[PDB]
Amino acid sequence: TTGIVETHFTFKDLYFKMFDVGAQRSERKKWIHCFEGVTAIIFCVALSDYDLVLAEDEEMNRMHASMKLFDSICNNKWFTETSIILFLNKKDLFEEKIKRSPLTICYPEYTGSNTYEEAAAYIQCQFEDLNRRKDTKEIYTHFTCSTDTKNVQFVFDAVTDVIIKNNLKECGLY
Amino acid sequence: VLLVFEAKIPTSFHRKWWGLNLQFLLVFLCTFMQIVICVIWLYTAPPSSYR
Amino acid sequence: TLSAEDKAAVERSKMIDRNLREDGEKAAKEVKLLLLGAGESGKNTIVK
């Protein structure tokens, strides 16, 4: 059935629990305060979606919608001290499609070449600059893929950093 | 600082071990041993001035 | 002073509270992460 999906896994003696709420097709301003006390918010953004367009509007890049959703959930009144772990996915499809089409299709003021690195850093910067609260929260960004287990390692390290910094703030030492 | 960095779980018990008043209490214990020794010294055999 | 049913209720309440304490202590030790994105956002792949 639909609803929130709950996932458990143990990694280096830590029991990670994750809650997928993509099945919730309703107003998010009525249940998002339930997740007020979460260690981190893992946000997935597909890099290969700059060329694509959402069929609902036919003039709406899915990357712009991802940016809107990320900004909405980042600067929420409840997540004022919660860290966000960004996952820029499908780096390979981006690698070929940037060779085919420039990133100017999505952002009209890109002003750059068609190499993977410039566009990747550009999308990362455009996402991270949407963090208006640059004092009490941090964004950790990855590029995933690699068909490996480095993703859980990155999540573990980022969660450990979040926990340590939370303790430091609670002590006043940060 | 060491106790804060040693934690890697949302802390419940060791959080009681890095409170400000507890830090001042530990400082008090050390300086209190010192002042106890000094008071016993000045009460039992006090120093004097000699010509 | 108290009825036998009253003592039984008291110890039942104490057992319930003790179980609640154990469950809270257990629930304290895990990390809760909120996963967000879109269907075609690599969300399923990152869960993988």
Curated annotation (Swiss-Prot), chain B:
Residues 1-21 are annotated as: Intracellular loop 2 (ICL2). Ubiquitinated by RNF19A; which induces proteasomal degradation. Residues 1-21 are cytoplasmic. Expressed in the temporal lobe, frontal lobe, parietal lobe, hippocampus, and cerebellum. Also found in kidney, lung, liver, heart, skeletal muscle, placenta. The chain crosses the membrane at residues 22-44. It is found in: Cell membrane. Changing K8A: Does not affect G-protein-coupled receptor activity. Belongs to the G-protein coupled receptor 3 family. Homodimer; disulfide-linked. Interacts with VCP. Interacts with ARRB1. G-protein-coupled receptor that senses changes in the extracellular concentration of calcium ions and plays a key role in maintaining calcium homeostasis. Senses fluctuations in the circulating calcium concentration: activated by elevated circulating calcium, leading to decreased parathyroid hormone (PTH) secretion in parathyroid glands. In kidneys, acts as a key regulator of renal tubular calcium resorption. Ligand binding causes a conformation change that triggers signaling via guanine nucleotide-binding proteins (G-proteins) and modulates the activity of downstream effectors. The extracellular regions of the homodimer interact in a side-by-side fashion while facing opposite directions. Each extracellular region consists of three domains, LB1 (ligand-binding 1), LB2 and CR (cysteine-rich). The two lobe-shaped domains LB1 and LB2 form a venus flytrap module. In the inactive configuration, the venus flytrap modules of both protomers are in the open conformation associated with the resting state (open-open) and the interdomain cleft is empty. In addition, each protomer contains three anions, which reinforce the inactive conformation, and one calcium ion. G-protein recognition is mediated by the intracellular loop 2 (ICL2) and the C-terminus, which contribute differentially towards the binding of the 2 G-protein subtypes G(q)/G(11) and G(i)/G(o), resulting in distinct CASR-G-protein interfaces. The C-terminus confers selectivity for G(q)/G(11), while it contributes less to G(i)/G(o)-coupling. The C-terminus adopts opposing orientations for G(q)/G(11) and G(i)/G(o)-coupling. This is Extracellular calcium-sensing receptor. The chain holds residues 702 to 752 of 1078 of the full protein.
UniProtKB/Swiss-Prot annotation, chain C:
Residues 32-45 are annotated as: G1 motif. Changing G42S: In ARCND1; likely pathogenic. It is linked to Auriculocondylar syndrome 1: An autosomal dominant form of auriculocondylar syndrome, a craniofacial malformation syndrome characterized by variable mandibular anomalies, including mild to severe micrognathia, temporomandibular joint ankylosis, cleft palate, and a characteristic ear malformation that consists of separation of the lobule from the external ear, giving the appearance of a question mark (question-mark ear). Other frequently described features include prominent cheeks, cupped and posteriorly rotated ears, preauricular tags, and microstomia. Belongs to the G-alpha family. G(i/o/t/z) subfamily. Mg(2+) binds at N44. Heterotrimeric guanine nucleotide-binding proteins (G proteins) function as transducers downstream of G protein-coupled receptors (GPCRs) in numerous signaling cascades. The alpha chain contains the guanine nucleotide binding site and alternates between an active, GTP-bound state and an inactive, GDP-bound state. Signaling by an activated GPCR promotes GDP release and GTP binding. The alpha subunit has a low GTPase activity that converts bound GTP to GDP, thereby terminating the signal. Both GDP release and GTP hydrolysis are modulated by numerous regulatory proteins. It is found in: Cytoplasm; Cell membrane; Cytoplasm, Cytoskeleton, Microtubule organizing center, Centrosome. The chain holds residues 4 to 51 of 354 of the full protein. Changing L34A: No effect on binding to PLCD4. GDP binds at E40, S41, G42, K43, N44, T45. Heterotrimeric G proteins are composed of 3 units; alpha, beta and gamma. The alpha subunit contains the guanine nucleotide binding site. GTP binding causes dissociation of the heterotrimer, liberating the individual subunits so that they can interact with downstream effector proteins. Forms a complex with CCDC88A/GIV and EGFR which leads to enhanced EGFR signaling and triggering of cell migration; ligand stimulation is required for recruitment of GNAI3 to the complex. Interacts (inactive GDP-bound form) with CCDC88A/GIV (via GBA motif); the interaction leads to activation of GNAI3. GTP binds at G39, E40, S41, G42, K43, N44, T45. This is Guanine nucleotide-binding protein G(i) subunit alpha-3.
